[PDB]
Amino acid sequence: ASFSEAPPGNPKAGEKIFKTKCAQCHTVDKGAGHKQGPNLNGLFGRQSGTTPGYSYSTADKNMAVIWEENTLYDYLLNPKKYIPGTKMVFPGLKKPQERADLISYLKEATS
Ligand code: HEC
Structure with a gap:
């Protein structure tokens, strides 16, 4: 139900x-620029809606969510429910395991 209880x-x-499910719209490497969505480099621990050069929705800026395993796990289940008004078109990742695996990769990749 929460990151705390999720699979390894x-x-x-x-x-x-x-x-x-994500590469179409996001980069992860430093220097790679943006796509439909912002580059996710250095995501972990950063405030939402702050990457330079990307035009965020007002919601994504206003929410000012500090991204971490916890928040990402909730977010990914249903992005539009988490940040109503976001322009990210993505239904969500329903399974706890899928979210846990994705987060594990992001931790490594966005470093
Ligand atoms: C294009 C169709 C997208 C797909 C597929 C995914 N994302 Fe996305 N993402 C997209 C946009 C246009 C935006 C900006 C939304 C806004 O309201 O401004 C985003 C944003 C994110 C964020 C927030 C980053 C921030 O700097 O605050 C994250 C963490 C994110 N996207 C992650 C993510 C992942 C892991 C995806 C696969 C499950 C994924 N997105 C899909 C566009 C698109």
């Missing part, structure tokens, strides 16, 4: 997930 994460599995 496997970054290899998480990579598959990222590639198929």
Whole structure:
């Protein structure tokens, strides 16, 4: 129900997930620029809506969520429910395991 109770994460599995469901709109490497969505480099611990050069929705700026395992796990279940008014078009990742694997990868990849 929460990150706390979620399955352990496997970054290899998480990579598959990222590639198929997020890569279209997000970069992760420093210097890579933006896509439909902002570059996620250095995501962990940062305030939402603050990456330079990307035009965020007012909601994504106003929420000012500090991204971490906790917040990401809730967010990913249903982004539009988490930040009503966001322009990210993504239904959500329903399974606890899928979220845990994706987060494990992001931790490594966005570093
Ligand atoms: C294009 C169709 C998207 C897909 C697929 C995914 N994301 Fe996304 N993301 C997209 C946009 C246009 C935005 C900005 C939203 C806004 O209201 O401004 C985002 C934003 C994020 C964020 C917030 C980052 C921040 O700096 O605050 C995160 C953490 C994020 N996106 C992650 C993410 C992941 C892990 C996805 C696969 C599950 C994914 N997004 C899909 C566009 C698109």
